[PDB]
């Protein structure tokens, strides 16, 4: 039961790891030719 | 009879546009032609009450 | 085995200490707080427009202008005949309470107040008008005057009532009448019947009439209790009161 | 007759526009023509007292 | 809506929303377009304007 | 007991901030054109 | 009993975020062409 | 009877601020147009 | 008769497009022509309920 | 009859083409002519389960 806190901290780091991957996204780029 | 509709409603002053389209502003204690006297103004939920008992609302479609 | 589920649930609680229902409720509370902040005590003054003729008599009462804090008012000045009168110069006192916006050549000025209950005075001088015009301004009255038109006693740099009758503005001194059986406007101001419609009058006959571009007719005539109106090729009769 | 309507009013000075439209600037101590003596002036509550006991308020159509 | 400049008339009221564009193009009595000279806005802390 | 003075203090801070926010008012702006 | 404080302090931090999140509003772009 | 001390403190701050509020007065501004 | 379908659905206001191509939007309280009176709007699961017991979902090809 | 072959296998959507070349994309709750309706969608092995009891798959050569 003492391992839960460690078992909680690691996934919390994992959780915040994914959300910054969830939120962040780059916009489009447009190319033009003549 | 001409029917007025609530156009802009804020505490204190209430805007009413009539059936003919005439727009005016009114206070709590005031006389409303065709209806009588404004006996109550409810800025929340947009309900206006007249001393003759009529209830004044917005245009149902235009809302 | 349920160790993983317990860890996941406590981690979720740490990550999101607020339920979506709590989010919605607190957002609503914030919106209501914003409404309370924006709420203004008493009642807002009535937006009004006014027109008045300034008397330049030595004993004349100086004109007074109603104002309100944080609002824009327009002041336009024409001569007695109503011709526009461009302004030459102006002078302001107590500049902190009142900010003046003024174009170089316009005869109209825009002014906004800054404080609540501090009255002031203003001075104006026109292009040809030698005598300066002084007015007083009082903020925060029961009504807010957005537009104020002022007539000057003298002739302006340039130089009608029936036209304004056609437009819809009654001449001063008008008293209402009673017209039955027809949709026409009838007014009495100086014992002259001013009748506005879109149809044509046949039997009484007018001495002066005006027309609009949109197709509105306004005749001025003497008092006659009975009228004959022709429209759509047919002529009928109606009667009035007084 | 002629009825004076309040247009501008603050403590100390009161500007009243008559039914004819004439503007009159008066104080507490001043004899109102055709009504008597101004008994009391109150900028708020829309109350003016005349020596004849008359109560005078702001103009109705301009509120 | 038709605007009348008589002293007893009422100013035109325009409904707005935060973050939403409200449009106003000036037309005469006949409805034909009519160019604008200039304008003046009180308290731009609550409103944003774009004009040519 | 102490709650009275604590909430007095925090309410006073909030009210001072709110009245400060009420105090300031900006000015109008002209916008010409040709 | 005392667990309320931490369970309240955390959401307070996020609460400060959310009101700030709704606080800011950008401005429109007067995009023009030729 | 110690209430005078806090009565001294609070009223002093307002009054000392209050007195100069009626004191300072701005001047005129002349605008010429051509 | 004319059948309506959901086109733009959010909490509060819902957009309905009829079989005739007429597209509009309504709220919870509004008399829907042809169907009657709207009694419940759910942004989830794409359900719109009428007082006449009529249920509108998204089109099978348009969802 | 007409035989359909799946094209894009993803959760949620599924693109497919028929023997005649007719092309479509279907969700979990969707209608497929001649095969009833798609009762269950599996991203594994590219199989689509229809209410007709059929298991639409990718063509052996067209894979």
What characterizes the major β-sheet of chain C?
5 strands, mixed
Chain oligomer state:
part of a larger assembly
SSE-based structural type of chain B: mainly beta
Q: What is the distance, rounded to the nearest whole angstrom, between the alpha carbons of the first and last residues of chain C?
A: 100 Å
> How is the largest sheet of chain B built, in terms of strand order?
4-5-6-7
PDB class: translocase
Keywords: T4SS, translocase
Entry title: Reconstruction of the Legionella pneumophila Dot/Icm T4SS 3DVA Map 3
Chains A, F, G, H: IcmE protein
Give me some keywords for this one.
part of a larger assembly; 10 chains; A: 34 residues; mainly alpha; 1 helix; B: 63 residues; mainly beta; IcmE protein (chains A, F, G, H); DotF (chains B, D, I, J)
Short structural summary:
The structure is cut from a larger assembly and holds four copies of chain A (34 residues), four copies of chain B (63 residues) and two copies of chain C. Chain A is 59% helix and 0% strand. Chain A is mainly α and 34 residues long.
Tell me what you see in this structure.
Chains B, D, I, J: It comes from Legionella pneumophila. Chains B, D, I, J: This is DotF. Chains A, F, G, H: It is found in: Membrane. Chains A, F, G, H: Belongs to the TrbI/VirB10 family. Chains A, F, G, H: This is IcmE protein. This is part of a larger assembly, with four copies of chain A (34 residues), four copies of chain B (63 residues) and two copies of chain C. Chain A is mainly α. Chain A contains one helix and no strands. In chain A, 0% of the residues are buried. With 63 residues, chain B is mainly beta. Chain B is built from no helices and seven strands. In chain B, strands 4-5-6-7 form a four-stranded antiparallel beta sheet, with no helix packed on it. A three-stranded antiparallel beta sheet of chain B has the order 1-2-3, with no helix packed on it. In chain B, strand 5 and strand 6 form a beta hairpin. Chain B is globular and about 25 Å long. Chain C is α+β, with helices and mostly antiparallel strands. Chain C has helices spanning 3-15, 20-38, 161-167, and strands spanning 46-53, 64-67, 72-78, 87-92, 98-101, 108-113, 120-126, 133-139, 143-151, 175-176, 178-180, 185-188, 193-197, 200-201, 208-211, 217-221, 226-231, 234-241. Chain C has a five-stranded mixed beta sheet with strand order 1-9-3-6-5, with no helix packed on it. A five-stranded antiparallel beta sheet of chain C has the order 10-12-13-16-15, covered by helices on one side. Chain C has a four-stranded mixed beta sheet with strand order 2-8-7-4, with no helix packed on it. Chain C is flat. Chain C binds chain D through residues 46, 48, 61, 63-64, 66, 117, 119, 138, 141-143, and chain D through 7-10, 15, 22-25, 46, 58, 62-63.
